[model samples]
Target: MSGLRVYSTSVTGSREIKSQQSEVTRILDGKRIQYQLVDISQDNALRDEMRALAGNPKATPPQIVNGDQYCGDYELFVEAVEQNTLQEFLKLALE
Candidate 1:
């Protein structure tokens, strides 16, 4: 049941990147957000795939996606979290 997809890089990447990825999932996990952690480092194609979806070739790891649609980055995710807009942010079907 991979409800949400969080794109991350391999541990070999910088700690900052790894930490952000962790934080993203940490928040999601706390909010009962079902997620699938996808690694872009292992698969070269996925980086571009996520980049294109995110509308930024430079889009870093920890990009968010709801099914096949681009959700946003960690900053946006946290914004929605802090502002209580997760329902629309994640397009939750519960409503």
Candidate 2:
């Protein structure tokens, strides 16, 4: 399994990323959300496989640790990269 990626992120809007991550964190702690898929335990093979693919194998979803961001702002830095996967998806934000 790919190890955790809780390093200092280049994301400028780290706060927003933290907020978004917090919601996911809460769901994993047994707090249910409306229409949320709340199954983190490795009880179900299919669901556990899905979680692993989704980047949460230890059942510990990405969360703010030591207060830092974990994602990039492709919306602002879209053109920074020559061949960005988000260029096509975030080009509209540039306009």
Worst 10 residues of 1 by lDDT: 86-95
- Model 2: lDDT of residue 38: 29
Each model's C-alpha lDDT? 0.77, 0.34
Model 2, which residues run further than 4 Å from truth? 1-13, 31-95
Clashing pairs in 1: none
1-95 per-residue lDDT for model 1 (tens digits): 43577888875478687778778878778878556788788888887788887788877888887678777788888788787876667765565
lDDT leader = 1
Clashing pairs in 2: none
Evaluate model 2: give its lDDT.
Answer: 0.34
The local distance difference test score of model 1 is 0.77
Clash count in backbone of candidate 2: 0
